[PDB]
Amino acid sequence: NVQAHLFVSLGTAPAIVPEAFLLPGARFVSVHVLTTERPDVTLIREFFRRHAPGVNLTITRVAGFQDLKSEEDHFRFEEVMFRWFLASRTGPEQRFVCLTGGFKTMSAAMQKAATVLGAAEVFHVLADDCCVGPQGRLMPPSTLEEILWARDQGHLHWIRLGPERGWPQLRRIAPEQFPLQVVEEKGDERRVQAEDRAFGTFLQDLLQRASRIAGAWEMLPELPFADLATWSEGELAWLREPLDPRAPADQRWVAGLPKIELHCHLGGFATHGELLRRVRNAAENPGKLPPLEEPRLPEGWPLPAQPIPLAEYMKLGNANGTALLRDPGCLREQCRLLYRHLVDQGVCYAEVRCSPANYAEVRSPWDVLADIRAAFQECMEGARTAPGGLPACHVNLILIATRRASGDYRAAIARHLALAVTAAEHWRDENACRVVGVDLAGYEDEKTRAHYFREEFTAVHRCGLAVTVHAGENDDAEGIWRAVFDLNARRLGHALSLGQSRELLRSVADRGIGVELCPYANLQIKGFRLDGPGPYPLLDYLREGVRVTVNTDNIGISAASLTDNLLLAARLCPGLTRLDLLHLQRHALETAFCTATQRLTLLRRISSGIPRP
Amino acid sequence: NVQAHLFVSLGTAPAIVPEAFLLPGARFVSVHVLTTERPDVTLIREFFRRHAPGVNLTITRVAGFQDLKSEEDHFRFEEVMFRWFLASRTGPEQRFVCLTGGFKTMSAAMQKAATVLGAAEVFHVLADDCCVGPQGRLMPPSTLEEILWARDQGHLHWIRLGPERGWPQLRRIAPEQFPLQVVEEKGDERRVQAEDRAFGTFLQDLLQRASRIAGAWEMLPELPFADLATWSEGELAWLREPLDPRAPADQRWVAGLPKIELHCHLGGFATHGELLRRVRNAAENPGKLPPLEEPRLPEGWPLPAQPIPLAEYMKLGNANGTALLRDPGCLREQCRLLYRHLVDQGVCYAEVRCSPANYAEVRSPWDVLADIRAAFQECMEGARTAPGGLPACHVNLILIATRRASGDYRAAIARHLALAVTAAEHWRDENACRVVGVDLAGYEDEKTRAHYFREEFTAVHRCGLAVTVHAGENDDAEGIWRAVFDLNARRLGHALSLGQSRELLRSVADRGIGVELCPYANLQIKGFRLDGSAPGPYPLLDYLREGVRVTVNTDNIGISAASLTDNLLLAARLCPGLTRLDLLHLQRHALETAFCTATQRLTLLRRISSGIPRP
RNA sequence: AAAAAA
Ligand SMILES: Nc1ncnc2c1ncn2[C@@H]1O[C@H](COP(=O)(O)OP(=O)(O)OP(=O)(O)O)[C@@H](O)[C@H]1O
């Protein structure tokens, strides 16, 4: 609109600037001149002194650019040129960039700047030979007397290349982001200088990410996250090859992924090693802790030769069962230790399962739950990091029915649900460690306890809590079927035997009900064909559309972290692409019991968290 | 190991090319000089004849452009240059451009070409003033010794600006796609001219789209469809300001959206006007159809002054339905007319609700449904243009289960639910119309709420089928809770009494049950106030803010006398502040709650994303 | 029309 500015760069031909100034339809108000620390400017100053009263010249000079010996001379020019544009607070509709003067690279740089910063008009001034001069037919060099005579004689030509819109986040920036080091500036004649070439790096990053996103924009629906669209073709191709857990490069990459944990038990964290001693070393009543009875693991335990029944499986964690956690001091220590382990693993969101009733001899179950929530809430507050001041790992609680088989069962589940329902109401802050769901494994499978569970669990749905059902031993399709439809569960633990029931598998995928697989737990309790009991159903379920996640289950009892869980899934199912591991994380995100606002934050937190190769 | 081609532009001062060819550390082949109907090339040809046996020189002359006079002169050169780049094969790893020579615009265009097209090296040749002549200390302009002396003495510089990435879709394109028309040619040198400005607009299209997609990226998730993020800043700004139903510009826009219909009844539709007459002219037993008696619609039926109740609304339009659609010709014509209506309305996916067992004297309900399915399937085969050679509109079927007041209606429910199980499993062709769900419609009452048919619906869940329900049509939130948790419903119909119970509203949003609303019918039954002028406020805008997956459907088109576009337009008029962005959320919500395979859901996602029209 | 607008 108003206040059209002019950006021109000249070499040793001073007449360029006055020629470009009187571009037909100019109405200029401030001409800016870019020089090279050689040519005289007394003519441009003279021209704009006699018949250009207010034009507000700025003659930038680019210190230390006398000649063009090497490209380092040119690179110093590009950084100065870009910062020179921003030093004048001018919009795209005000720049009338002219590319005429200086070396060809100097002029070509002016073209690039206008395209990637926006310019209302980019033109180039010509002058046919009409000044007679000493030798015949010289273009007009002779001050104002001939330049004015050139305009009215129909000599100067203005080839205009039209406007340039420029990139949406380049056409304002701010001059203070990339300041100019003024050195030795006289009246309206400044020798600018740049301390670093940050803008050149900043601009290059933006063009290449814009190129990558455009080159891979055809298939965003398949890409689990948006940030993967900013990857090179090679990296994207590398992402679709089968995972190689043997390769150290793959192992490092998986360890760096932001992960989501959904099936982790608080009572099976530190059952061996130094961690068990750490819990015992922090006890309020050291006289009452049972003697060290660390169990003996099966030969080659992390990858056992033969599967073991669940009876011997749970017995591997007696050293850290209810015996050690009845003391309130040990309970806080383990929660801190488990939280620290999760952050080291890189988990951005976890749902630690727990059963406060088991750890309640003198204190009430509510005291156990209050201590558990306080222990996690303290850690989340203390481990304050990440953008926006959000906790490094957000931990929610899911309550499990007591593993104890003695005592009345109807009341035991009644206490379980009643504790959870009031727990959800007691702690209601969204960003705090909040109880989000219940587990209903062990309440059924007792003289056809489906009917009792189908009516004594309606309170959970009425109060708004979530329900996850951990399918037990020899999970039949009917047992899963009632878990999906009779009691409205939203996640099914394990449930390996689901491919047999094709119709149920269609129903699970269609309703988007999550499935919580855990490799080492499954391998160490049921046995599966490792490398080259049927095949592990992880790959098959994912192709169908089942919301499948990879979790840890017990950590200490399995002696394997979540990072190891993802690696083993490749060994259990040869064929997992590195893209698939990212799908599992998104499936965990979209089936977690967090809220919509928290889900969006995790999605973008995970999106810009994936380590590039 | 690369072949290392060279690209260079020539002005009136030749011998640039030998200098460019003498770039240290590269054995170039197939030099590709540019000239413009003027500069001499004898010196360049001689140099390669005598000092470069087989480096395969080529020269092009760029059309009838000989003196820079207007922008059309430059624009002609630019597109000739770009095609000349493509005509030369091979990609970035081979290119060695040299922006030296020619006009300033020619040099500037050369660098831009390498930037947006890929180049292994961009350099510029500077010749020192180390030769003599009429002036003295002059350039090495001519001769063979001077250039060779320039190299051997070493007073040449070759400032190198480093390689460029180049946009991957612009690294090869295809020379055949953008041919460079060739005019009179001798050996080596030739003259070419571009017929149209095809490449310039193509490249401008990519960069313009890349700019918009880059800026509107940090907030992409707020966009329902990814393809939306290629619009101007104003267009995005215009898309967020509230919809104006009265504005003709918006009315034409909404009529252009690709819609998805989830809640539409075959029993219904044409009940007045020419549409009903058309059906009865296709009957194959004209003597059996009942006489012409179309029930009298109340005053201003599209926007009635008073809310009629549910019992009356069902009997509005009895001239079409159980009585009329008994002739097999009438049933086929109903399906044909609805499909044409849907395609004209722009719907890309519909789920027509029907009750085939309502139509049986000699034709069994299976026969009637087979005819309905065949009637739609042949229509989909007919109007099979679409994008990608698909059906124009994909129509699926949901069998209704009515429960009126009395009689042996539960046997009809038992028959519909059993029929759906057999039918859905029988027609497994993914690309063809097939029964995908059941329904629970009719008279909603506390006596027959949602859960008195839980024993009846067990078979449907076992076989695997979607289940909808009309919970909340006129009952409280408790009816909705029964439908969600005792029937395991996947889509609630007309769930208006849902905002009262906060836990249910959160539970529905968290699980993802789609709430099927319909503006005209809800205005014509519960009498919601219009234009923000007592049933209460309409919850459409409330549901979207809370995150409940909601969609705007049509119910009976003829009985409500309003199409899908009318329903969408009325929603903004009936819920003030409804942004045009929210209309796209409804389509996204409808897509993610529709009963269809994942493969089809992906296909619709791309089709709807590209179908959204700019203002 | 390469070290400085044709
Ligand atoms: N908007 C609506 N809300 C609730 N129930 C509806 C609505 N529209 C139709 N119904 C009921 O759903 C079923 C739809 O029947 P359909 O349209 O296939 O045939 P019909 O000949 O019109 O039926 P009928 O005379 O029994 O209502 C019937 O039970 C109808 O009462």
User: Is B296 in contact with B302 (CB distance < 8 Å)?
Assistant: no
Bridge partner list, A259: A347
Question: For residues A313 and B363, what is the distance between their CA atoms, to the nearest angstrom?
Answer: 62
User: Is A57 in contact with A45 (CB distance < 8 Å)?
Assistant: yes
Question: For residues B430 and B380, what is the distance between their CA atoms, to the nearest angstrom?
Answer: 13
Region of residue B396 (phi > 0: left; psi between -120 and 50: alpha; otherwise: beta): beta
Give me the amino acid identity at B225: F
Reference A588, options A566, A555, A560; nearest CA is A566
Task: Compute φ and ψ for A538, nearest 5 degrees.
Answer: -65, -55
CA distances from B243 to B347, B571, B574 (A): 20, 10, 11
Question: For residues B609 and B225, what is the distance between their CA atoms, to the nearest angstrom?
Answer: 6
Whether B157 sits inside 8 A of A69 (CB atoms) is yes
Strands (E), A271-410: 347-354, 394-399
Query: Which method was used?
Result: cryo-EM
User: Is A203 in contact with A239 (CB distance < 8 Å)?
Assistant: no
Residue of B402, B553, B556 to test ligand 1 pocket, by largest number of atoms within 8 Å of CB: B402
Give the contacts of A376 (CB within 8 A, at least 6 positions apart): A335, A339, A352, A395, A397, A433
Question: For residues B330 and B328, what is the distance between their CA atoms, to the nearest angstrom?
Answer: 5
Residue of B355, B438, B522 to test ligand 1 pocket, by largest number of atoms within 8 Å of CB: B355
User: Is A98 in contact with A19 (CB distance < 8 Å)?
Assistant: no
Question: For residues B64 and B80, what is the distance between their CA atoms, to the nearest angstrom?
Answer: 11
Quick one: CA dihedral B51, B56, B62, B68, positive or negative? negative
CA distances from B39 to A125, B57, B59, B386, B525 (A): 22, 16, 11, 54, 83
Chain B interface mutation, best of A74, A159, A173, highest count of B Cβ atoms under 10 Å? A159
Q: Cβ(B322) to ligand 1 under 6 A?
A: yes
Q: Which residues of A are annotated as a binding site for Zn(2+)?
A: 263, 265, 439, 470, 553
Q: Which three-class secondary structure state does DSSP give residue A6? A: strand
User: Is A44 in contact with A17 (CB distance < 8 Å)?
Assistant: yes
CB atoms inside a 10 Å sphere around CB B366? 15
Reference A608, options A230, A197, A187; nearest CA is A230
Nearest-CB residue to A211 (from B165, B220, B481): B165
CA distances from B450 to A138, A191, A454, B441, B593 (A): 96, 82, 17, 10, 21
CA atoms within 13 A on the CB side of A163: 11
**Chain C nucleotides near the protein (CB, 7 A):** 1-6
* B contacts of A115 (beta carbons < 8 Å): 112
Q: Which three-class secondary structure state does DSSP give residue B530? A: coil
Q: Cβ(B524) to ligand 1 under 6 A?
A: no
DSSP A432: S
Element (H or E) spanning A30, and its range?
Answer: strand A28-34
CA angle at B96 for the pair B93 and B102, rounded to the nearest 5°: 150
Task: Pull the structure tokens for residue B369.
Answer: 């449904």
Question: For residues A279 and A287, what is the distance between their CA atoms, to the nearest angstrom?
Answer: 14
Q: Which three-class secondary structure state does DSSP give residue A348? A: strand
Q: Find the radius of gyration of the CA atoms of chain A.
A: 36
- For atom 15 of ligand 1, the residue with the nearest CA is B267
Question: For residues A198 and B322, what is the distance between their CA atoms, to the nearest angstrom?
Answer: 76
Displacement of CA A165 from its chain's centroid (Å):
30
Q: Cβ(B266) to ligand 1 under 6 A?
A: yes
Give the contacts of A308 (CB within 8 A, at least 6 positions apart): A298, A524, A525
Residue B323 CA, closest ligand 1 atom number: 21
> In chain B, which residue's Cα lies nearest the Cα of A505?
B464
Task: Pull the structure tokens for residue A389.
Answer: 């001041």
CB atoms inside a 10 Å sphere around CB B542? 15
Question: For residues A21 and A31, what is the distance between their CA atoms, to the nearest angstrom?
Answer: 8
* A contacts of B221 (beta carbons < 8 Å): 226, 600, 603-604
* A contacts of B166 (beta carbons < 8 Å): 211
Q: Which three-class secondary structure state does DSSP give residue B251? A: helix
- Resolution (Å) of this entry: 3.2
CA distances from A534 to A477, A499, A569, A574, B367 (A): 16, 11, 15, 14, 43
Task: Pull the structure tokens for residue A35.
Answer: 């020089």
Question: For residues B142 and B42, what is the distance between their CA atoms, to the nearest angstrom?
Answer: 11
CA atoms within 13 A on the CB side of A361: 8
CB atoms inside a 10 Å sphere around CB A408? 9
CB atoms inside a 10 Å sphere around CB B79? 23
Reference B91, options B120, B62, B60; nearest CA is B120
Question: For residues B34 and B108, what is the distance between their CA atoms, to the nearest angstrom?
Answer: 14
Quick one: CA dihedral B355, B356, B357, B358, positive or negative? positive
Question: For residues B394 and B608, what is the distance between their CA atoms, to the nearest angstrom?
Answer: 13
Q: Cβ(B400) to ligand 1 under 6 A?
A: yes
Strands (E), B384-518: 394-399, 402-403, 435-438, 441-442, 466-469, 491-493, 514-517
Element (H or E) spanning A126, and its range?
Answer: strand A123-127
User: Is B28 in contact with B53 (CB distance < 8 Å)?
Assistant: no
Task: Pull the structure tokens for residue A318.
Answer: 């007696």
Reference A47, options A138, A146, A186, A152; nearest CA is A146
Residues 57-96 of A with CB under 8 A from B: 68-71, 73-74
List, edge to edge, every strand of the sheet that includes B514-517: B260-265, B349-354, B394-399, B435-438, B466-469, B491-493, B514-517, B550-552
Question: For residues A502 and A510, what is the distance between their CA atoms, to the nearest angstrom?
Answer: 12
Strands B58-60 and B31-34: parallel
* A contacts of B511 (beta carbons < 8 Å): 490
DSSP A119: B
DSSP B226: G
Distance in Å, residue A175 CA to nucleotide C4 C1': 28
A97 CA → ligand 1 middle, Å: 69
Q: Which three-class secondary structure state does DSSP give residue A346? A: coil
Strands (E), B418-549: 435-438, 441-442, 466-469, 491-493, 514-517
Bridge partner list, B469: B492
Distance in Å, residue B218 CA to nucleotide C1 C1': 46
Give the contacts of A278 (CB within 8 A, at least 6 positions apart): A270, A333, A337
Residue with tokens 């969006």: A600
Distance in Å, residue A67 CA to nucleotide C4 C1': 10
Question: For residues A2 and B444, what is the distance between their CA atoms, to the nearest angstrom?
Answer: 67
Task: Pull the structure tokens for residue A71.
Answer: 């490209």
Question: For residues B239 and A399, what is the distance between their CA atoms, to the nearest angstrom?
Answer: 45
DSSP A258: -
